[PDB]
Scaffold this active site. Sequence first.
Site, PDB file in Angstrom:
ATOM      1  CG  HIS A 136      11.173  -5.166  43.358  1.00 17.82           C
ATOM      2  ND1 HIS A 136      12.303  -5.557  42.665  1.00 17.82           N
ATOM      3  CD2 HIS A 136      11.024  -6.059  44.360  1.00 17.82           C
ATOM      4  CE1 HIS A 136      12.836  -6.615  43.249  1.00 17.82           C
ATOM      5  NE2 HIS A 136      12.079  -6.939  44.282  1.00 17.82           N
ATOM      6  CD  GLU A 150       7.876  -8.186  42.517  1.00 20.30           C
ATOM      7  OE1 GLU A 150       8.090  -7.829  41.337  1.00 20.30           O
ATOM      8  OE2 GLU A 150       8.434  -9.167  43.040  1.00 20.30           O
ATOM      9  CG  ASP A 158       9.517  -9.168  46.040  1.00 24.02           C
ATOM     10  OD1 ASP A 158       8.359  -9.248  45.571  1.00 24.02           O
ATOM     11  OD2 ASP A 158      10.545  -9.227  45.327  1.00 24.02           O
ATOM     12  CD  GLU A 174      11.627 -12.100  46.487  1.00 22.94           C
ATOM     13  OE1 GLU A 174      12.338 -11.090  46.711  1.00 22.94           O
ATOM     14  OE2 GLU A 174      11.434 -12.557  45.346  1.00 22.94           O
TER      15      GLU A 174
END
Length: 437
Positions: A227, A211, A213, A216
Amino acid sequence: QKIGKLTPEVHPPMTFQKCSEGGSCETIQGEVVVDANWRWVHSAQGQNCYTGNTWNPTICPDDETCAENCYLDGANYESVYGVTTSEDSVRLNFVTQSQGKNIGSRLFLMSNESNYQLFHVLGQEFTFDVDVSNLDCGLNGALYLVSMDSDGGSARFPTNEAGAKYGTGYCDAQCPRDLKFISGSANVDGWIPSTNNPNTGYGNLGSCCAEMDLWEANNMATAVTPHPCDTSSQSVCKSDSCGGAASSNRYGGICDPDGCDYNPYRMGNTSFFGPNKMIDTNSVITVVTQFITDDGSSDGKLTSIKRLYVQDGNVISQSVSTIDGVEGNEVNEEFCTNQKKVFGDEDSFTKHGGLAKMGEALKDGMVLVLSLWDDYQANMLWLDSSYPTTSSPTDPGVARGSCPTTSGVPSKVEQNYPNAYVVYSNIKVGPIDSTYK
Ligand SMILES: *[C@@H]1O[C@H](CO)[C@@H](O)[C@H](O)[C@H]1NC(C)=O
Protein backbone atom coordinates in the site's frame (compact mmCIF):
# COMPACT_ATOMS: atom_id res chain seq x y z
CA GLN A 1 1.33 11.06 25.96
CA LYS A 2 2.95 10.92 29.40
CA ILE A 3 4.15 7.73 31.14
CA GLY A 4 2.59 6.07 34.20
CA LYS A 5 4.18 3.14 36.07
CA LEU A 6 1.35 1.53 38.06
CA THR A 7 2.52 -1.58 36.19
CA PRO A 8 6.09 -1.80 34.82
CA GLU A 9 6.50 -2.10 31.04
CA VAL A 10 8.47 -5.27 30.34
CA HIS A 11 8.90 -6.28 26.67
CA PRO A 12 8.74 -9.99 25.81
CA PRO A 13 11.99 -10.90 23.94
CA MET A 14 12.28 -12.45 20.50
CA THR A 15 15.33 -13.17 18.38
CA PHE A 16 15.56 -12.78 14.62
CA GLN A 17 18.30 -13.14 12.02
CA LYS A 18 20.26 -10.97 9.62
CA CYS A 19 21.90 -13.07 6.94
CA SER A 20 24.88 -10.86 6.05
CA GLU A 21 26.62 -13.84 4.43
CA GLY A 22 24.59 -16.71 2.96
CA GLY A 23 24.51 -18.79 5.01
CA SER A 24 24.16 -19.96 8.63
CA CYS A 25 22.28 -16.75 9.51
CA GLU A 26 23.43 -15.02 12.75
CA THR A 27 21.10 -14.07 15.62
CA ILE A 28 19.97 -10.75 17.10
CA GLN A 29 18.16 -10.15 20.43
CA GLY A 30 14.93 -8.27 19.75
CA GLU A 31 12.00 -7.44 22.01
CA VAL A 32 8.29 -6.92 21.25
CA VAL A 33 6.04 -4.11 22.47
CA VAL A 34 2.29 -3.59 22.16
CA ASP A 35 0.66 -0.70 20.27
CA ALA A 36 -0.23 2.07 22.74
CA ASN A 37 -3.85 2.13 21.50
CA TRP A 38 -4.39 -1.26 23.18
CA ARG A 39 -3.06 0.18 26.49
CA TRP A 40 -4.80 1.56 29.53
CA VAL A 41 -4.78 5.32 29.54
CA HIS A 42 -5.52 6.68 33.02
CA SER A 43 -5.43 9.90 35.06
CA ALA A 44 -2.82 10.54 37.76
CA GLN A 45 -4.96 8.97 40.48
CA GLY A 46 -6.42 7.01 38.84
CA GLN A 47 -9.40 6.75 36.44
CA ASN A 48 -9.63 6.03 32.68
CA CYS A 49 -9.21 8.86 30.18
CA TYR A 50 -10.60 6.60 27.43
CA THR A 51 -13.22 3.83 27.79
CA GLY A 52 -14.39 1.55 24.97
CA ASN A 53 -15.22 3.91 22.09
CA THR A 54 -14.91 7.32 23.77
CA TRP A 55 -12.98 9.79 25.94
CA ASN A 56 -13.86 10.91 29.47
CA PRO A 57 -14.79 14.64 29.15
CA THR A 58 -14.04 15.61 32.76
CA ILE A 59 -10.47 14.32 32.19
CA CYS A 60 -10.28 15.11 28.45
CA PRO A 61 -12.27 18.03 27.08
CA ASP A 62 -9.59 18.63 24.40
CA ASP A 63 -6.25 17.41 22.94
CA GLU A 64 -3.89 19.27 25.28
CA THR A 65 -6.13 19.35 28.34
CA CYS A 66 -6.44 15.62 27.79
CA ALA A 67 -2.73 15.07 26.98
CA GLU A 68 -1.69 17.16 30.05
CA ASN A 69 -3.82 14.92 32.30
CA CYS A 70 -3.43 11.45 30.77
CA TYR A 71 -0.83 8.73 31.35
CA LEU A 72 0.06 5.51 29.46
CA ASP A 73 0.94 2.45 31.52
CA GLY A 74 2.62 -0.94 31.34
CA ALA A 75 1.08 -3.94 29.65
CA ASN A 76 0.64 -7.31 31.31
CA TYR A 77 1.50 -9.29 28.17
CA GLU A 78 0.56 -12.87 29.12
CA SER A 79 -2.33 -12.06 31.50
CA VAL A 80 -4.42 -9.51 29.58
CA TYR A 81 -3.24 -9.65 25.92
CA GLY A 82 -2.55 -13.39 25.45
CA VAL A 83 0.86 -12.40 24.14
CA THR A 84 3.88 -14.62 24.85
CA THR A 85 7.30 -15.13 23.27
CA SER A 86 9.89 -17.95 23.36
CA GLU A 87 13.23 -18.14 21.52
CA ASP A 88 12.45 -17.07 17.95
CA SER A 89 8.64 -17.26 18.21
CA VAL A 90 5.71 -15.06 19.26
CA ARG A 91 2.14 -16.10 20.09
CA LEU A 92 -0.95 -13.91 19.76
CA ASN A 93 -4.24 -15.19 21.17
CA PHE A 94 -7.57 -13.90 19.96
CA VAL A 95 -9.87 -13.46 22.98
CA THR A 96 -8.28 -13.13 26.44
CA GLN A 97 -10.46 -13.12 29.56
CA SER A 98 -8.76 -11.73 32.64
CA GLN A 99 -10.89 -9.59 34.96
CA GLY A 100 -11.67 -7.73 31.72
CA LYS A 101 -12.15 -8.79 28.10
CA ASN A 102 -9.34 -8.13 25.58
CA ILE A 103 -9.41 -8.82 21.82
CA GLY A 104 -6.29 -9.37 19.75
CA SER A 105 -3.20 -7.23 19.78
CA ARG A 106 -0.88 -5.21 17.62
CA LEU A 107 2.83 -5.60 18.40
CA PHE A 108 6.06 -3.93 17.17
CA LEU A 109 9.52 -5.54 16.95
CA MET A 110 12.34 -3.64 18.64
CA SER A 111 16.12 -3.82 18.55
CA ASN A 112 16.58 -2.04 21.85
CA GLU A 113 14.18 -1.12 24.67
CA SER A 114 13.72 2.26 22.97
CA ASN A 115 13.77 1.67 19.19
CA TYR A 116 11.74 -0.29 16.68
CA GLN A 117 13.87 -2.42 14.40
CA LEU A 118 13.90 -0.83 10.95
CA PHE A 119 13.96 -3.36 8.13
CA HIS A 120 15.53 -2.42 4.82
CA VAL A 121 14.14 -5.20 2.65
CA LEU A 122 14.36 -3.56 -0.78
CA GLY A 123 16.56 -5.73 -2.99
CA GLN A 124 16.45 -8.31 -0.21
CA GLU A 125 14.16 -10.98 1.19
CA PHE A 126 12.15 -11.14 4.37
CA THR A 127 11.35 -14.67 5.48
CA PHE A 128 9.33 -16.10 8.37
CA ASP A 129 7.57 -19.18 9.62
CA VAL A 130 4.02 -19.02 10.90
CA ASP A 131 1.36 -21.28 12.37
CA VAL A 132 -2.14 -20.36 11.19
CA SER A 133 -3.64 -23.81 11.88
CA ASN A 134 -5.46 -22.44 14.92
CA LEU A 135 -6.93 -19.44 13.14
CA ASP A 136 -10.25 -19.65 11.34
CA CYS A 137 -12.53 -17.59 9.09
CA GLY A 138 -13.36 -14.07 10.22
CA LEU A 139 -9.82 -13.77 11.64
CA ASN A 140 -6.68 -12.12 10.38
CA GLY A 141 -3.14 -12.87 11.53
CA ALA A 142 -1.22 -9.97 9.95
CA LEU A 143 2.55 -9.63 9.77
CA TYR A 144 3.39 -6.39 7.91
CA LEU A 145 5.68 -3.35 7.55
CA VAL A 146 4.92 0.35 8.05
CA SER A 147 7.07 3.48 7.71
CA MET A 148 6.82 4.36 11.40
CA ASP A 149 9.43 6.50 13.12
CA SER A 150 12.13 4.32 14.71
CA ASP A 151 11.79 6.32 17.96
CA GLY A 152 7.94 6.16 17.90
CA GLY A 153 7.81 9.82 16.82
CA SER A 154 9.17 11.13 20.13
CA ALA A 155 11.91 13.35 18.70
CA ARG A 156 9.71 14.96 16.05
CA PHE A 157 6.99 15.82 18.61
CA PRO A 158 8.13 16.99 22.10
CA THR A 159 4.82 16.19 23.81
CA ASN A 160 5.39 12.43 23.23
CA GLU A 161 7.35 11.43 26.34
CA ALA A 162 6.52 7.72 25.94
CA GLY A 163 8.24 6.95 22.62
CA ALA A 164 8.78 3.53 21.10
CA LYS A 165 9.26 1.88 24.53
CA TYR A 166 5.49 2.20 25.08
CA GLY A 167 4.47 1.32 21.50
CA THR A 168 3.73 4.85 20.30
CA GLY A 169 3.60 6.33 16.81
CA TYR A 170 1.64 3.77 14.81
CA CYS A 171 0.55 4.55 11.26
CA ASP A 172 -0.53 2.62 8.19
CA ALA A 173 -2.05 3.14 4.70
CA GLN A 174 -5.59 3.62 6.10
CA CYS A 175 -4.58 6.84 7.87
CA PRO A 176 -6.43 5.49 10.91
CA ARG A 177 -8.12 8.11 13.04
CA ASP A 178 -9.03 5.71 15.88
CA LEU A 179 -5.51 6.01 17.37
CA LYS A 180 -5.62 7.69 20.79
CA PHE A 181 -2.33 9.54 20.41
CA ILE A 182 -1.06 10.87 17.07
CA SER A 183 2.03 13.02 16.55
CA GLY A 184 2.35 13.62 20.30
CA SER A 185 -1.14 15.06 20.56
CA ALA A 186 -4.12 13.27 22.10
CA ASN A 187 -6.66 12.60 19.37
CA VAL A 188 -9.66 13.99 21.24
CA ASP A 189 -11.24 16.76 19.16
CA GLY A 190 -14.29 15.94 17.01
CA TRP A 191 -14.39 12.40 18.44
CA ILE A 192 -17.24 10.28 17.15
CA PRO A 193 -17.74 6.66 18.19
CA SER A 194 -17.81 3.97 15.50
CA THR A 195 -21.29 2.72 14.59
CA ASN A 196 -20.68 -0.97 15.39
CA ASN A 197 -17.25 -1.46 17.06
CA PRO A 198 -17.40 -0.94 20.87
CA ASN A 199 -13.61 -0.67 21.18
CA THR A 200 -13.27 2.17 18.65
CA GLY A 201 -14.10 5.74 17.77
CA TYR A 202 -12.78 8.28 15.25
CA GLY A 203 -11.08 11.60 15.93
CA ASN A 204 -10.09 14.56 13.76
CA LEU A 205 -6.44 13.33 13.46
CA GLY A 206 -5.36 10.33 11.32
CA SER A 207 -1.87 8.80 11.05
CA CYS A 208 -0.67 8.15 7.49
CA CYS A 209 2.29 6.16 6.17
CA ALA A 210 3.29 3.60 3.51
CA GLU A 211 2.44 0.00 4.45
CA MET A 212 3.61 -3.32 2.95
CA ASP A 213 1.28 -6.21 3.95
CA LEU A 214 3.61 -9.21 3.67
CA TRP A 215 1.03 -11.45 5.29
CA GLU A 216 -2.66 -11.15 6.08
CA ALA A 217 -4.04 -14.62 6.64
CA ASN A 218 -6.15 -17.25 8.32
CA ASN A 219 -6.26 -21.02 7.69
CA MET A 220 -8.66 -20.45 4.75
CA ALA A 221 -6.73 -17.73 2.85
CA THR A 222 -3.81 -15.34 2.59
CA ALA A 223 -2.80 -12.23 0.69
CA VAL A 224 0.29 -10.15 0.15
CA THR A 225 -0.47 -6.51 -0.57
CA PRO A 226 1.71 -3.32 -0.84
CA HIS A 227 0.00 0.00 0.00
CA PRO A 228 1.91 3.09 -1.19
CA CYS A 229 1.21 6.70 -0.05
CA ASP A 230 2.01 10.12 -1.51
CA THR A 231 4.07 11.04 1.58
CA SER A 232 5.74 7.78 2.61
CA SER A 233 6.87 8.63 6.15
CA GLN A 234 4.58 9.49 9.07
CA SER A 235 2.06 12.19 8.27
CA VAL A 236 -0.93 13.62 10.01
CA CYS A 237 -4.13 13.95 8.07
CA LYS A 238 -7.32 15.64 9.25
CA SER A 239 -10.92 14.45 9.22
CA ASP A 240 -12.23 12.63 6.15
CA SER A 241 -9.42 13.91 3.92
CA CYS A 242 -7.57 11.01 5.70
CA GLY A 243 -9.40 8.47 3.55
CA GLY A 244 -9.00 4.90 4.79
CA ALA A 245 -11.22 1.83 4.62
CA ALA A 246 -12.82 3.01 7.86
CA SER A 247 -14.71 5.92 6.16
CA SER A 248 -17.12 6.12 3.21
CA ASN A 249 -14.66 8.22 1.21
CA ARG A 250 -11.80 5.64 1.29
CA TYR A 251 -10.17 6.89 -1.95
CA GLY A 252 -10.14 10.54 -0.77
CA GLY A 253 -6.70 10.67 0.83
CA ILE A 254 -2.95 10.34 0.16
CA CYS A 255 -2.69 6.61 0.79
CA ASP A 256 -3.80 3.57 -1.10
CA PRO A 257 -6.49 1.91 1.09
CA ASP A 258 -6.95 -1.12 -1.22
CA GLY A 259 -3.44 -2.12 -2.35
CA CYS A 260 -2.17 -4.30 -5.18
CA ASP A 261 -3.22 -7.54 -3.50
CA TYR A 262 -2.21 -11.10 -4.39
CA ASN A 263 -4.62 -13.71 -2.97
CA PRO A 264 -3.87 -17.24 -4.33
CA TYR A 265 -7.60 -18.08 -4.25
CA ARG A 266 -8.67 -14.77 -5.78
CA MET A 267 -6.24 -15.22 -8.68
CA GLY A 268 -8.12 -18.47 -9.48
CA ASN A 269 -6.14 -21.33 -7.91
CA THR A 270 -8.43 -22.64 -5.13
CA SER A 271 -6.38 -25.78 -4.38
CA PHE A 272 -3.22 -23.89 -3.53
CA PHE A 273 -3.87 -22.61 0.00
CA GLY A 274 -5.97 -24.04 2.82
CA PRO A 275 -6.25 -27.01 5.16
CA ASN A 276 -4.86 -30.11 3.39
CA LYS A 277 -4.05 -28.03 0.29
CA MET A 278 -0.71 -27.65 -1.60
CA ILE A 279 0.20 -25.23 1.19
CA ASP A 280 -1.16 -26.91 4.31
CA THR A 281 -2.52 -24.46 6.88
CA ASN A 282 -2.63 -27.35 9.42
CA SER A 283 1.19 -27.34 9.26
CA VAL A 284 3.81 -24.62 9.89
CA ILE A 285 4.75 -22.66 6.76
CA THR A 286 7.89 -20.80 5.75
CA VAL A 287 6.93 -17.74 3.76
CA VAL A 288 9.48 -15.96 1.62
CA THR A 289 9.08 -12.50 0.20
CA GLN A 290 11.69 -11.11 -2.18
CA PHE A 291 11.72 -7.50 -3.39
CA ILE A 292 13.39 -7.27 -6.81
CA THR A 293 14.87 -3.84 -7.58
CA ASP A 294 15.63 -2.17 -10.92
CA ASP A 295 19.33 -3.10 -11.00
CA GLY A 296 19.45 -5.87 -8.37
CA SER A 297 20.49 -3.36 -5.70
CA SER A 298 19.15 -2.35 -2.27
CA ASP A 299 18.87 1.24 -3.61
CA GLY A 300 17.30 0.46 -7.04
CA LYS A 301 13.67 0.98 -8.11
CA LEU A 302 11.27 -1.76 -7.00
CA THR A 303 10.20 -3.82 -10.00
CA SER A 304 8.40 -6.81 -8.46
CA ILE A 305 7.54 -8.64 -5.25
CA LYS A 306 7.97 -12.41 -5.35
CA ARG A 307 6.61 -15.11 -3.03
CA LEU A 308 8.03 -18.55 -2.24
CA TYR A 309 6.88 -20.91 0.52
CA VAL A 310 8.92 -23.70 2.14
CA GLN A 311 6.83 -26.57 3.57
CA ASP A 312 7.98 -30.20 3.75
CA GLY A 313 11.30 -29.87 1.87
CA ASN A 314 9.58 -28.23 -1.09
CA VAL A 315 10.36 -24.70 -2.16
CA ILE A 316 6.97 -23.84 -3.69
CA SER A 317 6.60 -20.58 -5.58
CA GLN A 318 3.36 -18.52 -5.55
CA SER A 319 0.42 -20.05 -7.45
CA VAL A 320 0.08 -18.56 -10.95
CA SER A 321 -2.98 -16.47 -11.81
CA THR A 322 -5.55 -18.23 -13.98
CA ILE A 323 -7.70 -15.25 -14.84
CA ASP A 324 -7.80 -13.73 -18.33
CA GLY A 325 -5.80 -11.55 -18.72
CA VAL A 326 -3.78 -11.37 -15.52
CA GLU A 327 -0.70 -13.49 -16.15
CA GLY A 328 2.08 -14.47 -13.76
CA ASN A 329 2.52 -15.10 -10.04
CA GLU A 330 4.29 -11.94 -8.81
CA VAL A 331 3.15 -8.40 -8.08
CA ASN A 332 4.57 -6.04 -10.72
CA GLU A 333 3.35 -2.92 -12.60
CA GLU A 334 1.93 -5.06 -15.41
CA PHE A 335 0.11 -7.35 -12.95
CA CYS A 336 -1.37 -4.62 -10.78
CA THR A 337 -2.74 -2.41 -13.57
CA ASN A 338 -4.32 -5.46 -15.25
CA GLN A 339 -5.61 -6.85 -11.95
CA LYS A 340 -7.42 -3.61 -11.20
CA LYS A 341 -8.95 -3.47 -14.71
CA VAL A 342 -10.33 -7.08 -15.16
CA PHE A 343 -11.68 -6.79 -11.63
CA GLY A 344 -13.57 -3.52 -11.86
CA ASP A 345 -11.60 -2.07 -8.94
CA GLU A 346 -10.48 1.51 -8.40
CA ASP A 347 -6.78 1.59 -9.27
CA SER A 348 -5.78 3.74 -6.35
CA PHE A 349 -2.49 1.72 -6.29
CA THR A 350 -1.06 3.32 -9.45
CA LYS A 351 -2.48 6.72 -8.47
CA HIS A 352 -0.58 6.67 -5.17
CA GLY A 353 2.62 5.78 -7.07
CA GLY A 354 2.52 2.00 -7.56
CA LEU A 355 5.65 -0.07 -6.88
CA ALA A 356 8.03 2.81 -7.45
CA LYS A 357 6.48 4.68 -4.51
CA MET A 358 6.49 1.54 -2.33
CA GLY A 359 10.21 1.19 -3.12
CA GLU A 360 10.78 4.68 -1.68
CA ALA A 361 9.14 3.54 1.56
CA LEU A 362 11.15 0.31 1.72
CA LYS A 363 14.38 2.30 0.97
CA ASP A 364 13.86 4.10 4.24
CA GLY A 365 13.66 1.30 6.80
CA MET A 366 10.25 0.06 7.92
CA VAL A 367 8.82 -1.24 11.21
CA LEU A 368 7.50 -4.82 11.47
CA VAL A 369 4.00 -5.15 12.89
CA LEU A 370 2.43 -8.39 14.12
CA SER A 371 -1.32 -8.38 14.75
CA LEU A 372 -4.42 -10.49 15.29
CA TRP A 373 -7.97 -9.12 15.08
CA ASP A 374 -11.51 -9.46 13.74
CA ASP A 375 -13.24 -7.09 11.36
CA TYR A 376 -16.22 -4.99 12.43
CA GLN A 377 -16.03 -3.06 9.17
CA ALA A 378 -16.11 -5.89 6.56
CA ASN A 379 -16.21 -9.27 8.42
CA MET A 380 -12.96 -10.37 6.75
CA LEU A 381 -15.02 -11.42 3.67
CA TRP A 382 -12.62 -9.45 1.44
CA LEU A 383 -9.88 -11.81 2.62
CA ASP A 384 -11.50 -15.23 2.87
CA SER A 385 -14.98 -15.26 1.32
CA SER A 386 -17.08 -13.73 -1.45
CA TYR A 387 -16.83 -9.90 -1.59
CA PRO A 388 -18.82 -7.83 -2.04
CA THR A 389 -21.64 -10.21 -1.10
CA THR A 390 -24.06 -8.37 -3.41
CA SER A 391 -21.81 -9.31 -6.34
CA SER A 392 -21.72 -12.66 -8.13
CA PRO A 393 -19.13 -15.24 -6.90
CA THR A 394 -18.44 -16.14 -10.55
CA ASP A 395 -17.59 -12.49 -11.54
CA PRO A 396 -13.78 -12.11 -11.45
CA GLY A 397 -12.23 -10.80 -8.23
CA VAL A 398 -15.34 -11.49 -6.10
CA ALA A 399 -14.35 -14.82 -4.54
CA ARG A 400 -11.41 -14.55 -2.11
CA GLY A 401 -11.86 -17.85 -0.28
CA SER A 402 -14.21 -20.70 0.68
CA CYS A 403 -15.81 -19.10 3.75
CA PRO A 404 -19.51 -18.47 3.88
CA THR A 405 -20.75 -14.89 3.58
CA THR A 406 -22.26 -15.39 7.05
CA SER A 407 -18.78 -15.88 8.55
CA GLY A 408 -16.74 -13.12 10.09
CA VAL A 409 -19.45 -11.42 12.11
CA PRO A 410 -17.35 -10.08 15.04
CA SER A 411 -19.40 -11.35 17.97
CA LYS A 412 -20.06 -14.73 16.23
CA VAL A 413 -16.31 -15.27 15.81
CA GLU A 414 -15.72 -14.13 19.40
CA GLN A 415 -18.11 -16.85 20.67
CA ASN A 416 -17.02 -19.65 18.33
CA TYR A 417 -13.21 -19.16 18.26
CA PRO A 418 -12.16 -17.07 21.24
CA ASN A 419 -9.11 -19.31 21.78
CA ALA A 420 -7.79 -19.00 18.23
CA TYR A 421 -4.16 -17.89 18.06
CA VAL A 422 -1.32 -17.27 15.60
CA VAL A 423 2.35 -18.13 16.08
CA TYR A 424 4.97 -16.22 14.06
CA SER A 425 8.59 -17.37 14.27
CA ASN A 426 11.99 -17.73 12.67
CA ILE A 427 12.25 -14.15 11.37
CA LYS A 428 15.13 -13.51 8.93
CA VAL A 429 16.29 -10.61 6.77
CA GLY A 430 19.17 -11.34 4.35
CA PRO A 431 20.02 -11.18 0.60
CA ILE A 432 17.87 -12.91 -2.00
CA ASP A 433 17.92 -16.73 -1.69
CA SER A 434 19.94 -16.34 1.57
CA THR A 435 17.24 -17.03 4.19
CA TYR A 436 15.22 -20.03 2.98
CA LYS A 437 18.44 -21.92 2.12
C1 LIG B 1 -2.39 -24.37 -8.67
O1 LIG B 1 -1.07 -24.12 -8.22
C2 LIG B 1 -0.28 -25.27 -8.03
C3 LIG B 1 1.06 -24.91 -7.41
O2 LIG B 1 1.60 -23.80 -8.09
C4 LIG B 1 -0.12 -25.93 -9.38
O3 LIG B 1 0.74 -27.05 -9.29
C5 LIG B 1 -1.51 -26.34 -9.85
O4 LIG B 1 -1.39 -27.02 -11.06
C6 LIG B 1 -2.36 -25.08 -10.01
N1 LIG B 1 -3.71 -25.43 -10.43
C7 LIG B 1 -4.59 -24.54 -10.90
C8 LIG B 1 -5.95 -25.03 -11.29
O5 LIG B 1 -4.34 -23.33 -11.03
